[PDB]
Amino acid sequence: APDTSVSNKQNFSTDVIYQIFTDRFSDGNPANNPTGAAFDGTCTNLRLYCGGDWQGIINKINDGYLTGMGVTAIWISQPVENIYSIINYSGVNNTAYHGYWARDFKKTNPAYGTIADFQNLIAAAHAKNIKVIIDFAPNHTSPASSDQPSFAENGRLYDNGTLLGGYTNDTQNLFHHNGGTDFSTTENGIYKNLLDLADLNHNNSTVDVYLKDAIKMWLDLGIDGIRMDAVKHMPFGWQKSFMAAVNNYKPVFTFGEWFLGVNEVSPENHKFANESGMSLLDFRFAQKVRQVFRDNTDNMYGLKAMLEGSAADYAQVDDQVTFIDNHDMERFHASNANRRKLEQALAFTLTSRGVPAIYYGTEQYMSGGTDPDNRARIPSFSTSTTAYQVIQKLAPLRKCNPAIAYGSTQERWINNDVLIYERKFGSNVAVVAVNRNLNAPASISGLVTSLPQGSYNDVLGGLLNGNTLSVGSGGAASNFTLAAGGTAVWQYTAATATPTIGHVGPMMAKPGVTITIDGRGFGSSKGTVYFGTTAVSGADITSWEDTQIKVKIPAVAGGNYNIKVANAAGTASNVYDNFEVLSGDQVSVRFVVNNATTALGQNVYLTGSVSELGNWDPAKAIGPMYNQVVYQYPNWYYDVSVPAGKTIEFKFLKKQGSTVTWEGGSNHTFTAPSSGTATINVNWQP
Ligand SMILES: OC[C@H]1O[C@H](O[C@H]2[C@H](O)[C@@H](O)[C@@H](O)O[C@@H]2CO)[C@H](O)[C@@H](O)[C@@H]1O
Ligand SMILES: OC[C@H]1O[C@H](O[C@H]2[C@H](O)[C@@H](O)[C@@H](O)O[C@@H]2CO)[C@H](O)[C@@H](O)[C@@H]1O
Ligand SMILES: OC[C@H]1O[C@H](O[C@H]2[C@H](O)[C@@H](O)[C@@H](O)O[C@@H]2CO)[C@H](O)[C@@H](O)[C@@H]1O
Ligand SMILES: [Ca+2]
Ligand SMILES: [Ca+2]
């Protein structure tokens, strides 16, 4: 199949995601609606159930609402069974309509539907070329009170009907009992509870194994991707070990939520996206777009800077999921605001790098403050709005113009209010002009592009007051006036003659797994794939087309590799770096070192004999380690993903800047479990 096919679970860059709050979309089956005090059929009470479900979804798919818009994937609420208690939060009654209050990860939320409804969902979607994504929220269960076990469901966790345990009398240590976080530090927000939600302890084998198994069921159910909730609140190493479980089994595109505020730029965030095995929701992009097009708290120069930076910060920028709003923010559109702002922001998003996501109702100009105000019921299924039509014209370019799905981004013209950028991939180009200035037109002269000589029609057809473009030789455009609030898309597509890799997934896996290589110009005849210097050809290459190649990772050593391909004639492609070859299946192990005292601005790190530990390269050591919560300085700890059942040699180090101090003595040693988790405790050797 081609890169653009509905069956491509490894790449979403050519897709347009439609984010849905199941309850709030469409109640296709009134019979599963909760009753009594947990239900509000008028949906005036935003904290109860409104009755939206899988069937409703299925209906919208079939009546053409989503397909008409050009949407190609849907991202829905966590489908697992939630607690049933209504919770009164100081007078207010709250239900688990959101699906974030899990009780049993092996069952469905009956308000959403049955396993059979889930399966129909998957089928209908697939039948209409739409991929399905689900939220997955393994950080916790539900709200609990340790000394008021009668409160809610005591954070009870079941395994397919079987009671594993509760927050009260947690002898098994299924949960954390460290209090609640103040979000003060990263370590703080990982090992303490979020609010009152019962924090799962991933270091407990039962929990570990349980979650790894639960996800396999859904994978088996045919899902196309996973959206992880609260990734900044779980152990990084654990999460990496979970990704390996997915990837080594049935890889799917996975992205997590790591909130960023305005002007916030975090290196931890970057690193996580570059090394965890998953990508992220692009808050940096979102926050910046809002400042520029919404709140006018920054200008084009700001947008441009976010674009260039992010391209450098993320190893796989094209995997970050962009948006203008979602369930954690006020709706982009403000009641009294010019609708053009929202339209421009959509157009911008649809044509920019990454994986675009659209919060349900956007196309309807829904307004609403924070939670739960941003979670109202979709007032209508009209395809007559301008927003609806914008998406309808642009979404499809992601599939037919690879410049959009995988091309670089380049500023060609800029001022405070205007931004003209070019996307390029192979012999494909797209040019976008945006004039945020709703009152002033702009004189555009000196525009130079990569488009071939000729005239170009605005892809939006003038919908947002775009115009035609005239490119002479040398790709220089002739002077033109860009309307106030003006938005235009111009483009050029043609066949790519040389192999060009546009994407790869998954990015991390053990040998033997099949990965997918997407792009153009691969030719129709099997060529060769290189993993670093190792060549792979013949049978191991399970499939080869012009736009997509499927190949098995050779059994090479664990490490990072560059990928490159050669066509049947031997012409090579561009390199695609940062591929991680796991040393084998992974387990999550907690490392603890005692009496490692440091000086200010000096931290302990971990290194060792396997790629998962950096192979003795200090520049690749794991850390810095933690020393507040679970263990206190000068005791340091850290959860790490390691090759299962392997005998590993390791050592700790103290780093400051790039200056390193090794532990003395001989390597510590150990053998990783075959499954489950473990804890290694040792003392720092001087
Ligand atoms: O001519 C090539 C030139 O075009 C763009 O510069 C614009 C500039 O952004 C506008 O603010 C205004 O000054 O017109 C200039 C064109 O004369 C590119 O931004 C620039 O990098 C490029 O060299
Ligand atoms: O909280 C982590 C913290 O640990 C390290 O600092 C030690 C410091 O070296 C000691 O002299 C002592 O005062 O306790 C500190 C930890 O509370 C790192 O130096 C520091 O950067 C890091 O954040
Ligand atoms: O370079 C690989 C080498 O790294 C580590 O050796 C350390 C040694 O432990 C330190 O005490 C210090 O002398 O620096 C050496 C780095 O060259 C591992 O201990 C060793 O097994 C490994 O081969
Ligand atoms: Ca229903
Ligand atoms: Ca946690």
Swiss-Prot record:
Disulfide bonds join C43-C50. May consist of two protein domains: the one in the N-terminal side cleaves the alpha-1,4-glucosidic bond in starch, and the other in the C-terminal side catalyzes other activities, including the reconstitution of an alpha-1,4-glucosidic linkage for cyclizing the maltooligosaccharide produced. InterPro entries: A-amylase/branching_C (IPR006048), A-amylase_C (IPR031319), Alpha_amylase (IPR006046), Carb-bd-like_fold (IPR013784), CBM20 (IPR002044), Glyco_hydro_13_cat_dom (IPR006047), Glyco_hydro_b (IPR013780), Glycoside_hydrolase_SF (IPR017853). Residues 496-582 are annotated as: D. It catalyses: Cyclizes part of a (1->4)-alpha-D-glucan chain by formation of a (1->4)-alpha-D-glucosidic bond. GO terms for biological process: carbohydrate metabolic process. Residues 581-686 form the CBM20 domain. Residues 407-495 are annotated as: C. Changing D229N: Reduces activity 23000-fold. Reduces activity 520000-fold. The record marks D328 as: Transition state stabilizer. This is Cyclomaltodextrin glucanotransferase.
